[PDB]
């Protein structure tokens, strides 16, 4: 797909939906790339933390 200078060009790229039965995003801790820091409870209720983990 050609794109000239300073001109947006919408691009399509289909995806197969991810099946929830084999990915368990509800309960999967977020990775930390520099482990070994004191754990500080930021504070998020169960609903918000599940939403955040799913989105990430």
């Amino acid at each position: 797909y050609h794109v000239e200078a300073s001109h947006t060009s919408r691009i399509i790229v289909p995806i197969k939906k991810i099946d929830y039965k084999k990915y368990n995003f509800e309960n999967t801790p977020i990775p930390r790339i520099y482990p070994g820091r004191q754990f500080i409870q930021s504070g998020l209720n169960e609903e918000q933390t599940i939403e955040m983990r799913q989105k990430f």
């Binding site: 004191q38 754990f39 500080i40 409870q41």
Partner: protein
Amino acid sequence: GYDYDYLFKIVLIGDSGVGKSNLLSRFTTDEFNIESKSTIGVEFATRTIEVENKKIKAQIWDTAGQERYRAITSAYYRGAVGALIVYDISKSSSYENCNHWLTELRENADDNVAVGLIGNKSDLAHLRAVPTDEAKNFAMENQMLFTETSALNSDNVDKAFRELIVAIFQMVSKHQVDLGAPKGPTISLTP
């Protein structure tokens, strides 16, 4: 038993609900009247220690003020020589008040007062609402000792307490040094 040479007043000042009542309940000479915190503002603990042959008595006054104690709570620091700022590593609200607490302490109490800062209930690792790194950095900026305490992590508060007293002693200890008669008949030579 008035054998102690010196008597140092130290205030276990801290925020309400911090668990400081349980903090000082461990290290005690617990006898006599108790539960005097609501009687006026304070409850008392004492101990005698040996510091190179000079016995030293301590007086922990645990000041507390809920809503009505405004003037006397400050007046109890008329000649306080030590402070034991109590905070809890469970909520940022308790730690936020340390700046005001130190400001009042320095404004009212004796000039150049020794101050320590103790973090009660460090066993709880589920709600660590303030990091030890930031706490240590705050401790740097005022020349004031820092420690964190727990029931399972014993002896820390005790060694910090003894080292606080021996630090105060070097400041308010004026140096003290331990400072053949003629036997027989006599003849008077006065005129």
